[PDB]
Design a protein around this ligand. Sequence first.
Ligand SMILES: Nc1nc2c(ncn2[C@@H]2O[C@H](COP(=O)(O)O)[C@@H](O)[C@H]2O)c(=O)[nH]1
Ligand SMILES: Nc1nc2c(ncn2[C@@H]2O[C@H](COP(=O)(O)O)[C@@H](O)[C@H]2O)c(=O)[nH]1
Ligand SMILES: [Mn+2]
Ligand SMILES: [Mn+2]
Ligand SMILES: [Mn+2]
Ligand SMILES: [Mn+2]
Lengths: 321, 320
Amino acid sequence: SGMDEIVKVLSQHDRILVVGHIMPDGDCVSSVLSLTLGLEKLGKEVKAAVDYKIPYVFEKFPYIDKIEENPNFDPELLVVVNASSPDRIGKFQDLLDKVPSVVIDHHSTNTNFGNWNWVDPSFAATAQMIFRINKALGVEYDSNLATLNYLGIATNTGFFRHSNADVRVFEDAYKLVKMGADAHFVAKEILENKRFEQFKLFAEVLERLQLLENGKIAYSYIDYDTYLRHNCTDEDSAGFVGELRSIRGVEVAVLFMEFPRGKIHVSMRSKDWFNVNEVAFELGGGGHPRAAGVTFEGKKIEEVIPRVINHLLKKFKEGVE
Amino acid sequence: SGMDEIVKVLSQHDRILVVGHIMPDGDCVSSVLSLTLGLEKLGKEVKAAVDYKIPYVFEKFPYIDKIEENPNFDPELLVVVNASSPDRIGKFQDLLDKVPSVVIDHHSTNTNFGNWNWVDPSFAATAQMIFRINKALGVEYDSNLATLNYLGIATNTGFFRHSNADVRVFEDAYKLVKMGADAHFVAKEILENKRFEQFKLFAEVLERLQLLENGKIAYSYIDYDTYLRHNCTDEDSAGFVGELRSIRGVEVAVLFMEFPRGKIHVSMRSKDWFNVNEVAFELGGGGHPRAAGVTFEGKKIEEVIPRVINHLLKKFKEGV
Ligand SMILES: Nc1nc2c(ncn2[C@@H]2O[C@H](COP(=O)(O)O)[C@@H](O)[C@H]2O)c(=O)[nH]1
Ligand SMILES: Nc1nc2c(ncn2[C@@H]2O[C@H](COP(=O)(O)O)[C@@H](O)[C@H]2O)c(=O)[nH]1
Ligand SMILES: [Mn+2]
Ligand SMILES: [Mn+2]
Ligand SMILES: [Mn+2]
Ligand SMILES: [Mn+2]
């Protein structure tokens, strides 16, 4: 339930598979690698896995190749990090009935699907919880480990810009930079790594932009054929919904992205007050008050857009009193 | 001079004018207001001024209206912050050698033009130096003052992206947020305030973009008529050079901007190693190892661009 029990369980087991969520992000990579490396420093036999391609922006990060897609491994313990439901780890959810499991997560909707669960939504990033676990285990940080742990705190707060960048976030960042975290490397690789093809793709997104409610709601979409024409994938569009939110006067931005064929990811971002996690959760996804999402399979963009936007529109209009 | 002498000088004067630089940025607003408000807590009569319009993105900040353009004031002491030479403060340079003056700055090419000068280029922002002065003066931060002092640290590190975001930057940011700095407010006002017209403007920047040296140099330009065509000003283009640096593989980005007619501002940004301040300084400007600029008056943009690019390319090879 709490950190102390999870530390004990981690200490009790030797052969550990650490698993993160599909469509991984910086906090997934950060949490998986920081815990994996910490456990290896203790002398444990560990592998790391995500049922998804790792985005190109992580290619230069130290030890990124320890995250596998198809590990061959006989674990005594499964550790699932940064993932709110079993569906979020893809094919590794088949291990949940076979191998004892620990969940470590900061999402408030986490279904507590492990044998042991430490879920604390007062953190901005699961990487903050791994930092505390590692310190409680006595793991000594070098600059690479500090850089890897800094990654998730930076990305989940928008590099200290979002509503979740509180005192504890800045304190953790300071501690990690003091330990040698390369904050410039992290920002360069995540934020200054744009393929030029992105700009043309984003122009098409602006072309298709739709405005509702005096311009306070904005949404657009990228169908699969459009990714193809621009020689782009979902890795290329990762910053787009935040760019739509940055438009003056917009309170909610929504981007629908079909990649690969038939899989529609819906990203939602809000600015001052609208709780987008409430919309996402009711649609079957999850997230946070200012950033949330949901994913559909086998469905048509002509049906997802009205279903999502009509539900969002209703909840937005109700949010006035 | 060191900080301790400057703190002594500040304590010795009760009527003080705090001045920042023309074309003000976040560190200028941050430094000017944080020092002014700090000194006022000692009971002193303090005015703040910049010989320039304050950009729109600062208009919701607490006490922003304290920065005047035309103060009517007889100070005993002039304090110049975040400005590397007398020219950078516009008409207030006329006060030098008439009112005793203090310079507080983090630019390495500061000409030391005050009677007292504390210049420390190891800081990422002059706001960090103002923070330490206010602490030495013994004043108390509330959340408004913490937010105003946080502003310059945030903007001058590119919100913790630039290579100047060292451990001391994160320590200061932590201490200010602990005192109530509203980091989310600062980011939203500066970065989430984009006009639709800005996106059309940037599209023109991308149409004129050139990549040189196998994609390691990116440059473009905005002429005056293009600003007008898009109903934009140079306030709309303020983040553009950073967007060009964010292209994969680009080491240095350069943006030439003519606004208003006959004034050409050249903005430069680099990623890993190229010292753009050496280029800017040699052309008559200044700045920092990874961010620098120069401004020309009365010159033709079609003449400035090939000469600046030629000098840049020459320095780029020598740096290699
Ligand atoms: N449960 C769940 N949460 C999601 C899904 N997609 C996005 N999220 C949540 O929404 C946040 C933002 O996702 P993004 O819009 O960046 O894809 C994530 O941090 C995650 O918490 C999804 O398919 N399922
Ligand atoms: N001396 C001098 N420095 C400048 C000038 N323009 C820009 N800089 C320097 O270059 C940096 C970046 O300028 P920006 O590109 O953001 O306009 C500034 O922080 C400042 O130190 C100028 O006209 N003169
Ligand atoms: Mn995640
Ligand atoms: Mn999340
Ligand atoms: Mn400045
Ligand atoms: Mn400067």
